């Protein structure tokens, strides 16, 4: 009880004070600590006796304010705001992999499911049983965690007067580059290995799927031995769960065929063959091409024409243009990228369609967004993650500044003209059209003679003396951007090989002629729904813009997750990990904005016997600070005092020892 | 947001228009303004004093076809404005009041042409922003390189623009006024040897179509001259749009030979094969290493089958033996200018290089000579 | 610990840099600052106003090559700083904030040159300690002796510095301003006799390469003058970087003869063969015994094949008969200055002779005239 | 008796011939060899395969005009012999079998040119005695002095030859290949900006005549650039030989500005104003006192009105303030070379300096390199 659970209750806010308070709190299992309307949490790396059903019932309503912080409080307050405002809102959860964010989302989902008497309806659990497919499609091995979600999860569930209506799930961000290229000592998505592990022998020999060590799309990291960690059992469990959804066996066979074709697409080899005047393209063997065509039941000649020739056409003419080796490889990678992305979109659409959606009622939205990432060698993927986290941190800063402003207003009305930086230059350095880094890369993608190194020169000249841009001292192929979490370097390698989609119209038209209904219908829908989505960066920016234009009109509330230890160490807290997590989550932006309301009565009365200054102040107001100013030349900056608080106490840091030393010198 | 700046290549012959970003023009049609010449008798069939574009290609039997652009200089403006209005409204169905436009224009044309073009496209159409580029640079963009000698030969010009590492050489640019129109005229004047006469402007299109379909470039001119008089294998037939079939002998390859021996039509200047060589040896010394290996060509008149071989042979004969000669002949040369224009207009860096309406208003039409080039 | 003090020989032509202790420089490249001169047209290919070092040797067809050092006096500082910054960062990848640097500098150059060099390398680069030495003494170190007359002739100077038993003779130092640059200019002006013209700065490198590869020093000048007009055995051919092959006759040995008859280019002073003799007979009497036997030479311009024989013959003709003349011609003369600098910087005794930052701060740039020499 | 030795100045453009002693050439006409190109139809109007001299200037509408001399090097000999035969027989009506001839020739031309010239004029014409001189020295004779820097710029060369008290300075001679022909080509390429095209060789004479009649040198280039865009007073008109009248604006003084800013046509070397300064500061120190005061110039390209003022201003800006700059501009510069040749050939002392036929017979064409210079 000697500790403090609300950061607002703390008078002086320091990083050392925050870490000390958290270290004092965690022994008493105060995982949840209030910072106002924002709540954070830590991972105990163990199981806990679960917040019983009583916390859902008698701690709801106004009682959450007087209750100790808990996960159910934010959901209860969100439902209270639903009832009070009749408008939709959102709940956003952040953090790194292994911090229990998925488990936290499951817990909050079961809490909002059990808050009413409609728990006897199966649809409240059918949404949860269709979950494992998503993180099965979304988890890939990472240097920080073997089970890391590399996609953005959005779930929108309607609740009309406590009755849980249909739930709509959607995805916004997806690392399409990880489909074809993987970092060193890293794996692809687990489903590609699960198909290898759990497929029947007859289907394996019919599809020729025993070449995992040969597949170019899986051996990039050189680490396939982790695929034996109960992945066959996971495959069987996933098939059982998706059969619970009622997904037909023929459609499962179609999905397996498409995945096998995607994997076999990596077996296509291109070589420099002198056709007419320059070396253009060649294939060692068409057997892989024929297998790919037969898996989707498409004409092999058309696929070869599309992958080896770029076709331009108009009303009058149709002309085929031969493609170089690099361009052919890029197109072969991009077709697989779009195939996998559209498969994921179709499957999430099927999941949303299986559960019946209801009309437009009150709803609560939950975003499962991974937090800041910083590896040893940061690639384009890490740049995208940092940009998304920068936008999320901008929203967090806006909400925190609004809360601080309303606190000041409740304190004094003269704080309306107080404003701080809103992280705009950091976003504008990348998102602005004329000289944004992503925009510059997108422009350089179509340039005739564009290499990785020329991009460095373009960025260095265009940005130059920007305060947030950190040019490397030595001529190395990299640069550094100063985010809110500090300077982060980015090694420029294979950006031009990663930031290119350019899906042609002939490729789209070839697949809708296939005799499989699923892919033909899916590609027809994709063509019907589709702007400037030429490259991967443009698509990522468009998805982020769609997310923000979905979010802005809700004024949501966030919750933060932390990892007290780098690996599975229960109950171990160390300062360096605390600082790293605080920097990554952007929690220190709160104290940055705050720099508070110390009443001088405590300071005056504390030294009643030593300094012997009169403790008998009949009216504690402006006279004390005015006397301090007259005795120490205090700047007008220490003004706009409220009733007895709102003291920034900058000069007090040097005044305390000045007043202390003369008293001690007497002895 | 993304304004999707238009690219409207206004060549001497056909006109290519479309949106930036795409890999193919959205509108291809001859730039011909036709006016009726006969006396209308039926009531209600008149009141059409100008057929513009492709609709004037089918009704040409009663029209007089006039090209508003000859040799690349716009000699007629009242109908060029009509052609531009057609190309925008009746073809692309997009109002240029909220879309930037990017034009294509010859290297050594008179300045008054560009000034009047700028005046027309800012005052009448009220385009927010406009830019003028050189067709050779866009063609070089379309070839996926940054170093080479560009030989573009449309219907009015034939210009060599050598570029090295993105730096132009204005002292080595040579422009020739021998192009497809002169080839069509020479074919028309040489078909009369066999008895076929094409006098009115309506038959010029027939001659042009014959040239497009049947003409080809010989490898050795004298060898095929000897062969034609001793055999009938080179003879091919074409059908006029009235039922009668003509046969063309050695006039298939004697028509495009004017591009290599311009003394046929009275021109004194040598063919393009020697013009390229003389343009290359007007540059520095350590640059020919790349220019002899990056001989990129474009334009409509360069798809005559066999040109990329005779040109290479001639340049190899002219060039020193130790050096290597390479000819770049993409299969989409006639659309290379539009492809390069679309690539340029899609660059986010180029967005600063536009000529917005404020600068033109505060400077006038003379701003083209400083901003565009 | 061991700071591994750098040695960056900044000659009139090439620049040699590396670490002390090693027996070979780690960076050799011409000291040329080039700027583009043509009009850029491609978007994104500009924004490069200075190509420094070897990267400006391949793109010289569109650049203007300017030497920041002529005759050994640094006449341009803004680009010399660029060259030094390149040599450190972009080439050696070592920050000079924690590495001492040792410079090389001509004997009789103006004092302001050394003062400004010291100011630049302490203020901008913030080098902890710097020293300036004389190239002749380092060359003598590189020859493994402590007594001899050093004839170093780079691209800007040709100086004789006699040293006896480690004691210098400042009254006998003679410096001549005839060096490789004047030889290149004379070859360029004499090649026009056969019809070959090299006007722009880009062809100066071709002339220099021709001089490096084909030139040689005749033994008897008049005898080969007679031989050349009566035979074609001396003629050799070189290929320009465009395909055409030139043939050079008696201009192979008429170019380096300027070093022995400087009246060819208008200079009145006699050749180096007599300059060495006059420098030797400006010393004492009991010293010539060793100076005539230890005629060590270095510099780039002294590897013309046959120089060590003609020089010896001329000195023997000038010197008295009873005495013996010996010429020391190590096969690595052009790197002898750097070898000597590395040997000096590796000595633990020399560590006291540095100019640390404190002394410069308390004294200023004038400390060079007392500490370095 | 008095043989009246001929003087036949064979320049890059016009050719001046006459007798020694007189003060004016007896024959001025362009050195152009023309050949018919069209197909003759009338019987008896052919059999004329070469029109040489002024008679090829009126019939140029059916001829191809080829200059046998370019840049000052005789690149064509079969027609140069025809030109010489015309100049002697059909023009001067004197047999060279009994008259000595004195030639004019550029300073830094290839030796083979002089050797072949000597061979031609001794074997074919059988001239008893011949001599070759330098045009700059004869021009200096024509100015009535023996000390000054001669700037002669004809149609193929632009060379500075400083002479002091009758002694030449071969180490300070700088030759530039920018002359009247490049000015004509630049004017031809810049007239296309206004819409005027001159493609064939017959219109090159029209361009040259326009340059001769209307061109002038501006005093301050930027000031007149500003003035031209704000007024029409500088515009003047010329009439082509077909009836149509052209108007030329700021192209009158933008054509000869290439002589001062040769970067216009791609040349890197600076203008003649700085070339003269650099040639003067390649001489000794006690000589510039006279060279800055005796800046004699000649050649055809130096009568553009205003050159003697801009050149003086530029040299004064370059030269130190205390010194005085004087420009000598006689009104007969283009005939100064012939005047000097006639003055030299009339001297009785020079009669010993001839190359008689016996010496050539016993020595061969190589005697030119010893006797003439
Ligand atoms: N297959 C062909 N063979 C010969 N000539 C052709 C062929 N196709 C097109 N052309 C010529 O190309 C010309 C069209 O060129 P165009 O694309 O209009 O150039 P620009 O756009 O520069 O004016 C036509 O006049 C036609 O004569
Ligand atoms: N094989 C060679 N023959 C003749 N001259 C040479 C040869 N090699 C180099 N040189 C000359 O040496 C010069 C380089 O000298 P350099 O090492 O720069 O001297 P420093 O370092 O004192 O300036 C070049 O200008 C070149 O002309
Ligand atoms: N009034 C003039 N203004 C400008 N240029 C002129 C004028 N008169 C003659 N020229 C130029 O002078 C050239 C003739 O020079 P020329 O006497 O032939 O010299 P050279 O005899 O040395 O060849 C012509 O090419 C012409 O362009
Ligand atoms: Mg064109
Ligand atoms: Mg040296
Ligand atoms: Mg002359």
Numbering used by the authors:
A (entry chain D): 1205 to 1734, 1749 to 1813, 1818 to 1889
B (entry chain B), C (entry chain A), D (entry chain C): 3 to 375
What does the paper say about this structure?
Unconventional myosin-15 (encoded by the Myo15a gene in mouse and MYO15A in humans) is a plus-end directed molecular motor essential for stereocilia development and maintenance. Here, we present cryo–electron microscopy structures of myosin-15 bound to F-actin, providing a framework for interpreting the impacts of deafness mutations on motor activity and actin nucleation.
We thus turned to an alternative hypothesis, wherein the jordan mutant disrupts actin structural plasticity rather than global actin conformation. The D-loop is clearly resolved in the jordan mutant reconstruction, and the backbone and side chain of each residue can be fully fit into the density, adopting an In conformation indistinguishable from the wild-type reconstruction. Consistent with the helically averaged map, symmetry expansion and focused classification (K = 4) failed to recover any classes with Out D-loop density.
